[PDB]
Amino acid sequence: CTGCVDLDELSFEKTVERFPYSVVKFDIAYPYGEKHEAFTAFSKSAHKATKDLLIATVGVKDYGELENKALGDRYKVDDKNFPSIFLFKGNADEYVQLPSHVDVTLDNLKAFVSANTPLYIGRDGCIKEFNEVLKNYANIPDAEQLKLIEKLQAKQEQLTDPEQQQNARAYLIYMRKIHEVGYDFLEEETKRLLRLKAGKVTEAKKEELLRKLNILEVFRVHKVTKTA
């Protein structure tokens, strides 16, 4: 899969022991089907979020000389219950296995990581470095919102990643609209977005409305503090 590093007997221990955290799927050789695709979707989203995570696969598939059987055997897994998901904390030795009763899904995969690490794979659309400075945005003074608008605008102009650049535009538009009209903007843009989402939409268009609603969610406050 994309971003997934496939490992073997020679490279596995050495590669896992070079990243602070590793998520490995053991499965047949040449994997396919829905669980492998959920792992593929996990691998892409995990890269979007993190510097520090190895996403990796090991093929076992026992029909020949037996590639990687000894590696599956180290971690006690079996053609009989593939896929098996392991999370390692920096060496081949400190690992947690995803419970077999747990469906291998994007959602469970992300939960598996933050459950067991200081890593956080964020919501599709979020930019951690924008989120880090925008708590309570709607409630802070005109003058600080204006300087946050200026600080994030300069950050936006230095982003090198295409999806980050697009997601930043939506942060800045929300920032500016909230500064201009106040907390009532949240409800207006939620109603706008949710009306489109409740339409007949493609998978790809849904995802992109979800990116905006997750960005928008950043700006919700628990209480309204600032004079409207």
From Swiss-Prot:
Record note on what altering residue 61 to D/Y does: Affects subcellular targeting of pip
Species in which this protein is naturally found: Drosophila melanogaster (Fruit fly)
Protein name: Protein windbeutel
UniProtKB keywords: Chaperone, Developmental protein, Endoplasmic reticulum, Signal
Effect of residue 6 to N: Does not affect subcellular targeting of pip
Effect of residue 35 to S: Does not affect subcellular targeting of pip
Alphabetized SUPFAM superfamilies for the sequence: ERP29 C domain-like (SSF47933), Thioredoxin-like (SSF52833)
Note on domains (UniProt): The CXXC motif was initially thought to constitute the active site of a potential protein disulfide isomerase activity. However, such motif is not essential, suggesting that it has no disulfide isomerase activity. Its precise role remains unclear.
Tissue spec: Briefly expressed in the follicle cells of the ovary, at around the time when the dorsoventral axis of the egg chamber is first established.
Keyword Chaperone carried by entry: yes
